Ligand binder design. Sequence first.
Ligand code: ADP
Ligand code: MG
Ligand code: NI
Length: 259
Amino acid sequence: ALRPDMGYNTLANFRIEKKIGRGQFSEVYRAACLLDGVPVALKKVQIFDLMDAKARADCIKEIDLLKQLNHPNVIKYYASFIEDNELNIVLELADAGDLSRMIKHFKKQKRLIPERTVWKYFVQLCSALEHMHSRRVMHRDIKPANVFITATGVVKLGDLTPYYMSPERIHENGYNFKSDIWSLGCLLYEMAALQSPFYMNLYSLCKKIEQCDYPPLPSDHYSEELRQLVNMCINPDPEKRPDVTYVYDVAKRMHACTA
Ligand SMILES: Nc1ncnc2c1ncn2[C@@H]1O[C@H](COP(=O)(O)OP(=O)(O)O)[C@@H](O)[C@H]1O
Ligand SMILES: [Mg+2]
Ligand code: NI
């Protein structure tokens, strides 16, 4: 039964329409908020059957930080709450596809993504990430499949064996902001090459990374600007990588003067 005072924080205020995903830790549904008709993704997690006191604190503290985020290029966290012995996370529905599939399209058509199109999407992604960093929140899982795109071409940085392993993460050092920058650079490269720069185990990956053993992007399709931005973002040394604000400023310049 409906509970109007409860907003997005109770299952009674949602109607489940379809199971749309199965995760390793969760099951994901499409649903509608009965109060305003807004469609949403609803995750249900058995955190009591998989987590411990400490983990639940970390996860829940993190989710609560995430709900404060508010930006057009970042998946919105409307609510989270314990109910039926489960963590329920209510998220902005991002239903139309993602960067991983866009890249498959181009591969299938045997075409590269024009530089202009790369910037069109990358600049939105930078916008998303600068918002997060400005709020002192690290994303932690930047990868093409986690970069949703609406039917209208809007980037939606999705909800936080990882796809892009940074050197500090490979060696179990702390993830931090420069680690997001590393992923961001790998993603820019992947948009331009249609493959990860380091496309195979962690030792050989470490080797490759320390020696920049990745194939160069073709200079006849991609500007020095695009290629240098990749180069500096995936520098093995975190201190050599630029902050997100510098990356964003280039993306905006390049988006402006290629469109
Ligand atoms: N906000 C969302 N909107 C639509 N689908 C989503 C959303 N978040 C996740 N999904 C889908 O749910 C599936 C599994 O969720 P996932 O993020 O892997 O959860 P976990 O990693 O905790 O198991 C994925 O295929 C993904 O496409
Ligand atoms: Mg999963
Ligand atoms: Ni190593």
